[PDB]
Design a protein around this nucleic acid. Structure first.
Ligand SMILES: [Zn+2]
Ligand SMILES: [Zn+2]
Ligand SMILES: [Zn+2]
Lengths: 48, 49, 102, 214, 48, 511, 64
DNA sequence: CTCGTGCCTGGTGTCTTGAATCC
RNA sequence: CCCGGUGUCUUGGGUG
DNA sequence: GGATTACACCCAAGACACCAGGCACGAG
């Protein structure tokens, strides 16, 4: 249970849009802004 | 200066103008690279040279 | 809640004052003590809560050496040790104290 | 000898069960109530014991002979995850579930509470009952400067200066020992009792600043 | 009003894909029309 | 009174003494809005002061609670929080006063109210458009699907108008593809679709000849019978009630090992409750659900036989507007359960001490007060931790740029379909909008055609009890559902009251 | 064609979970439960609509 | 003088179940 | 005695 | 299962709950 949780945090640190499992959440309830989400979409590093 | 603006300057062929807009007139930055490994891993003290 | 430092049982502290330690009231006499005595033989600090339902046939109970005691809540680890004067008095009674603090 | 009490194949099985974090003690309690309430009836709860280890968050262990008894123990318990997640423990892993587990005088600990939280202190004395102790620590004082404290609005650490206290705001007790605002300072250090449960004794890392001082 | 408001985004997407498909295509000094890989798209621009 | 009592229980052995702890919620009382200073002093709050000090214009709500203590060897009014008051309503301190005093309270007589004040900011609730409950709608399905026609209905009770469940009946088989063209249904909390005949049997009417007598009321037409042919044969081997109910209980696949002795009794709840709960939920009334089920299948086949068009989703008679009343009740319902659970979790610790609780201490008014304030201030319709999977924009800051804009803003309606998907239906001005929503007033841009505005003479139904209507229908000659046979009644008219096939009359013209 | 499916059901005898395999032969309307552990076998009739939960239900009633 | 009881603050923290069509 | 800067994430309505 | 719904500008309104510990106040 411990080792899988380290795998989990390292995964959602890089990509928090993994299909088929719940997203990592901030205390505020909104999803964590992972590095992958920083680069994609209209406002990310590349298009924005 | 959005994506569609960028395309218009290409069509005009004004390559020099487009470079300046996106660098000198904005967020131009100087970095050091290693000629061997190509990474930005250089530690540069400019007063000690 | 406090844990007896002789048998490991977990009870509300006032119980130790009202009725003594069910398992070791006889030698410990907490029923007829003052609060200073109760607090020297029972601890507010303990860890590992154990429901023992069947003391005589539980392996868990045998390991914790509570297999001869009454069904109840017990603690795996009880912090503190019995005062040397009480240990000496228990030994006068043929009782051997094996500390439960680890 | 403890070695004669090791478990065997004749002993009941132990299952682990996942429960809501922080509700492990409650589940152990609830299991005991159910066991005692059903003793001697036609439908006894056929578990022997149940327990929860602090080191093992969100997991209760239950001793029985049949898996069905585990389901019976947990039925209706609002603190237990409904998924059929009950896992078997090996006999060779039983003892490692019930393992129970310094602060010598002249050694260093870190304080865990109050204006001295995080500060390094020497463990000068230990209370007889064993409940507390006495620690030697570098004071954080103002000499009553703005009187008519918290850890976020405390003062910088510095040795007690009795002549500063004399000048600005004090009871001599002994050689180098003063009581100032009802605390004791000996040769510049505060001597104050803390609960043992309020001091860290393990894995303490001295800081740069502490290496410079001590 | 609905049509103008809806179909403006339809054609806006069309223009974006067209530009990215064609942006690197340049006339070179030998008259050929080539992309950034030097692939020949037309041997002579506009055939004239 | 939706969940009127809390109940505990505890068998004690040490002389078994069952001690049920019970708490009953009674009458509600309301007080006028009151400002309580940090001092402790109180006074009546009027609107302008709330606007100037960023306060919330709200009324304290008190609830009677009653304790009782069953014991078997075998009082003061409590405050639940504050509810924001709509200005100029009956519970606002401005409703009285009259013309002479209004000017002294700095209130303008042209201000017609209809909005709330939350932290000094004026918030108006936007009417939310939804589909009607308790109506059957038939739609056609796209080509790459084995289904060609679907009947759908969303369950909802009358008491409080809150959603319950949703149910579908799908007709499989494409044009000359799908072989056996049978019909299966979808039930709440069951995995994969179950054939229609099986659920008919599972309700107590196994006789095939009786089954077809409940659906088709025209034995003469072969077509309304050839399409039901494969449904009989694919559910032939299930020949009695018990094995029918069992199969449904296995479909759910919840708690593997339910068994027949009980897996039937779990499925009987999924049939009695949840499945069509708007008809009835008391026992021994399964005749109404069986008759209704036959009606659905009949409607499904009429569309598949091209004898009736598929329903028009935009027909305004199939639509409802949720205004301030219904919207608050749904939110208040969610929050009152949250308060309930916190009372229940608090009793299990405070009774292990065996100490008489003070009652008020076990009611934290922050649950309702912060809940209503947060949702009205942000528009996020749900619990704060679940900003996701909820609806946004229900509350908006009242536009005060000009007087005309205030009138329009208080009469706005919203369809919550979404910007994504242009579509060629919703945004469009449907014929049935005539006289009910404005044909001209609609925003430019992404909301165009989805946000609408009520015509000048429109009104919204407040709601009325259906019970007096039933009494009027039976007094005039309506005949019960147990007396009805398609051979005898081959021509009478069916009668629906809020989507329920109650009684059928033989002479509708006089009625 | 036969269907060989693994399930997450507990064997009623050996109590090993996730070790019951279901073989459904629809051509002859014969379903077969197998353990992978103690390997106890149980046969029951199946229709065309049945699934591993249908014969595992029949196995619970065949014991009691 | 000493014990019972309410308020402020910091470390910690998760779950009763409840929009459509191109490749 | 030069130099001297302050916000991030969402929601609702507009403009073209 | 995923992939997407043209580009640019402005306005206003909201941001973390629960339990253990100490400290201060009141009563005997
Ligand atoms: Zn390098
Ligand atoms: Zn004891
Ligand atoms: Zn087996």
């Amino acid at each position: 249970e411990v080792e899988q949780l380290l795998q989990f945090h390292v995964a959602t640190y890089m990509d928090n849009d993994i299909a088929g499992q719940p997203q990592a959440l901030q205390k505020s309830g909104r999803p964590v802004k992972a590095i992958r989400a920083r680069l994609k979409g209209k406002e990310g590093r590349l298009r924005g | 200066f959005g994506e569609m603006e960028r395309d218009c300057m290409i069509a005009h062929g004004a390559a020099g103008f487009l470079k300046e807009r996106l660098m000198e007139a904005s967020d131009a930055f100087r970095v050091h690279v290693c000629g061997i490994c190509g990474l930005m891993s250089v530690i540069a003290n400019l007063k000690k040279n | 809640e406090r844990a007896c430092m002789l048998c490991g049982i977990v009870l509300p502290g006032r119980v130790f004052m009202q009725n003594g330690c069910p398992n070791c009231d006889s030698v410990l006499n907490l029923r007829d003590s003052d609060q200073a005595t109760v607090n020297e033989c029972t601890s507010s600090s303990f860890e590992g809560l154990v429901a023992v339902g069947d003391n005589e046939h539980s392996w868990v109970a045998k390991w914790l050496r509570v297999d001869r005691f009454q069904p109840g809540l017990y603690a795996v680890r009880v912090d503190g040790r019995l005062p040397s004067d009480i240990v000496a008095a228990l030994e006068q009674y043929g009782v051997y104290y094996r500390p439960r603090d680890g | 000898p403890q070695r004669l009490l090791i478990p065997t194949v004749d002993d009941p099985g132990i299952w682990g069960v996942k429960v809501r974090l922080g509700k492990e003690k409650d589940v152990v309690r609830q299991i005991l109530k159910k066991k005692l309430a059903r003793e001697g009836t036609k439908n006894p709860l056929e578990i022997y014991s149940a327990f929860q280890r602090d080191s093992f968050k969100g997991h209760v262990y239950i001793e029985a002979r049949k898996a069905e008894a585990i389901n019976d123990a947990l039925k209706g318990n609002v603190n237990v995850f409904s998924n059929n997640s009950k896992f078997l423990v090996g006999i060779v892993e039983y003892k490692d579930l019930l393992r129970p587990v310094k602060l010598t005088r002249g050694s260093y600990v870190r304080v865990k509470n109050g204006k001295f939280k995080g500060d390094l202190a020497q463990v000068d004395e230990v209370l007889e009952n064993g409940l507390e102790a006495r620690l030697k620590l570098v004071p954080r004082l103002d000499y009553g400067k703005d009187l008519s404290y918290t850890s976020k609005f405390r003062p910088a650490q510095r040795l007690f200066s009795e002549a500063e206290a004399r000048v600005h705001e004090i009871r001599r007790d002994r050689d180098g020992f003063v009581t100032y605002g009802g605390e004791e300072y000996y040769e510049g250090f505060l001597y104050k009792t803390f609960r043992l449960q309020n001091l860290i004794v393990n894995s303490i890392n001295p800081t740069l600043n502490e290496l410079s001082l001590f | 009003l609905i049509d103008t408001a809806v179909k403006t985004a339809e054609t806006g997407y069309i223009q974006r894909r067209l530009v990215k498909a064609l942006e690197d295509i340049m006339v070179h000094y030998d008259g050929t029309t080539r992309n950034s890989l030097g692939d020949i798209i037309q041997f002579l621009y506009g055939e004239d | 009174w939706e969940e009127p009592r809390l109940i505990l229980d505890q068998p004690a052995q040490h002389d078994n003494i069952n001690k049920r702890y019970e708490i009953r919620f009674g009458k509600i009382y309301l007080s006028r809005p009151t400002m309580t200073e940090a001092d402790g002093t109180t006074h009546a709050m009027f609107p302008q002061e709330a606007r100037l000090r960023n306060l919330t214009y709200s009324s304290p709500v008190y609830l009677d609670m009653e304790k009782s203590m069953f014991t078997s060897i075998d009082g003061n009014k409590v405050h639940i929080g504050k509810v924001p008051i709509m200005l100029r309503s009956k519970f606002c301190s401005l409703r009285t006063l009259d013309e002479v005093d209004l000017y002294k309270m700095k209130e303008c007589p042209y201000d017609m109210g209809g909005y709330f004040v939350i932290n000094g900011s004026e918030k108006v609730l936007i009417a939310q458009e939804r589909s009607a409950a308790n109506i059957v709608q038939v739609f056609k399905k796209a080509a790459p699907s084995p289904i060609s026609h679907v009947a759908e209905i969303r369950s909802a009770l009358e008491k409080g108008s809150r959603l319950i469940s949703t149910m579908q009946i799908k007709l499989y088989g494409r044009e000359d593809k799908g072989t056996g063209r049978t019909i299966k249904a979808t039930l709440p909390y069951v995995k994969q679709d179950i054939p229609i005949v099986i659920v008919f049997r599972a309700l107590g009417v196994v006789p095939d000849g009786e089954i077809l007598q409940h659906i088709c009321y025209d034995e003469n037409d072969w077509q309304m019978l050839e399409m039901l042919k494969p449904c009989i044969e694919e559910g032939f081997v299930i020949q009695d009630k018990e094995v029918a109910l069992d199969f449904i209980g296995r479909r759910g696949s919840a708690a593997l090992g339910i068994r027949r002795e009980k897996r039937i009794q779990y499925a009987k709840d999924i049939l009695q409750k949840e499945l069509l709960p708007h008809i009835t939920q008391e026992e021994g009334f399964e005749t109404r659900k069986t008759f209704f089920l036959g009606y659905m299948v009949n409607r499904l086949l009429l569309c598949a036989l091209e004898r009736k068009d598929q329903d028009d989703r935009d027909h305004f008679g199939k639509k409802r507007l949720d205004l301030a009343g219904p919207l608050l009740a749904n939110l208040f319902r969610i929050l009152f359960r949250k308060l309930t659970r916190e009372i229940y979790r608090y009793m299990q610790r405070c009774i292990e001490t065996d100490r008489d609780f003070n009652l008020n201490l076990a009611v934290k008014s922050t649950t309702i007060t912060s809940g209503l304030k947060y949702s009205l201030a942000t528009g996020n319709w749900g619990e704060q931790k679940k900003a996701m999977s909820s609806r946004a924009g229900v509350s908006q800051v009242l536009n005060r740029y000009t007087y005309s804009s205030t009138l329009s803003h208080l009469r706005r309606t919203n369809t919550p379909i979404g910007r994504d998907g242009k579509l060629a239906k919703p945004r469009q001005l449907h014929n049935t909008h005539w006289g009910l929503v404005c044909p001209a007033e609609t925003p430019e841009g992404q909301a165009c055609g989805l946000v609408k505005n009520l015509s000048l003479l429109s009104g919204i139904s407040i709601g009325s009890p259906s019970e007096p209507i039933i009494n009027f229908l039976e007094e005039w000659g309506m005949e019960p559902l147990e007396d009805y046979d398609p051979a005898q009644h081959t021509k009478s008219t069916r009668i629906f009251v809020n989507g329920v096939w109650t009684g059928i009359h033989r002479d509708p013209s006089m009625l | 064609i036969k269907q060989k499916l693994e399930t997450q059901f507990t064997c009623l005898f050996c109590n090993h979970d996730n070790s019951v395999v279901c073989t459904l032969d629809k051509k002859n309307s014969i379903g077969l439960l197998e353990c992978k552990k103690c390997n106890l076998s149980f046969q029951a009739p199946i229709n065309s609509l049945s699934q591993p939960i249908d014969i595992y239900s029949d196995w619970i009633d065949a014991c009691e």
